[PDB]
Amino acid sequence: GSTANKLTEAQRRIAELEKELQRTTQRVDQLSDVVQQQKDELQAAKDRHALEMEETRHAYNAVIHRKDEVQEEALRQ
Amino acid sequence: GSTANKLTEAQRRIAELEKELQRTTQRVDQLSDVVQQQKDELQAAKDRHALEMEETRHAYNAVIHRKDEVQEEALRQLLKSRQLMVSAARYEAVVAAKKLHAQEFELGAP
């Protein structure tokens, strides 16, 4: 085949490869976005659990303190 | 000439693109693997958090309940002890007031 014909075919293949590289690169960035969203969600869940655990511990400690005080006042009286 | 040179240039550009596509398609796969692992991780974490929260609440609650039980029984025993001291003092006061009044009355007999 002629050199010119080969060039036309090479130019077609370039255009085809560019399209496919664009498509695949677009998917990389979409997946990178999912990865970060998942990381944010995992931290958010950990933060929510820690907050619930801490609210519950403060409540327990307050109740123990309160019941000690009441008992103390009962025994002083 | 020019035609041949442009073909050589195009062949190089094809080789560059093919290698970039290979790398990009590998990155997609690496990211796809991360996405699935993070899904599994998220669920595992939610399950651990829920179990930990439930066990923690039950432990606090069992300790609070035992504290109420032990404290209330401490008062109940103290209050029973007081009721006994008082029922005995009250009986000892009738007994002594009766004895005193009988002695005073009797001393006055002929």
Author numbering:
A (entry chain B): 182 to 258
B (entry chain A): 182 to 291
What's in the article?
Kinetoplastids (such as Trypanosoma brucei), a group of evolutionarily divergent eukaryotes, have a unique set of kinetochore proteins that lack any significant homology to canonical kinetochore components.
To test structural conservation in other kinetoplastid species, we attempted to solve the crystal structure of the KKT4 coiled-coil fragment from L. mexicana. We were unable to obtain diffraction-quality crystals of fragments that had the N-terminal residues of the microtubule-binding domain (115–140 in T. brucei). We note that the expressed protein contained an additional 23 residues from the expression vector at its C terminus due to a cloning error (see the STAR Methods for details). Like TcKKT4117–218, LmKKT4184–284 has helices arranged in a parallel coiled-coil fold. The two chains in LmKKT4184–284 differ in length, with helices spanning T184 to the C terminus in one chain and T184 to R257 in the other. The region beyond I245, where the helices have moved away from each other, had high B factors in both chains, suggesting enhanced flexibility. Interestingly, the end of the longer helix, which contains extra residues from the expression vector, makes seemingly stabilizing contacts with other molecules in the crystal lattice, which potentially explains why our attempts to obtain diffraction-quality crystals for the proper construct ending at Q284 failed. Superposition of the coiled coils from T. cruzi and L. mexicana revealed a good structural match with a root-mean-square deviation (RMSD) of 1.03 Å (for 123 Cα), confirming the conservation of the coiled-coil structure in these species.
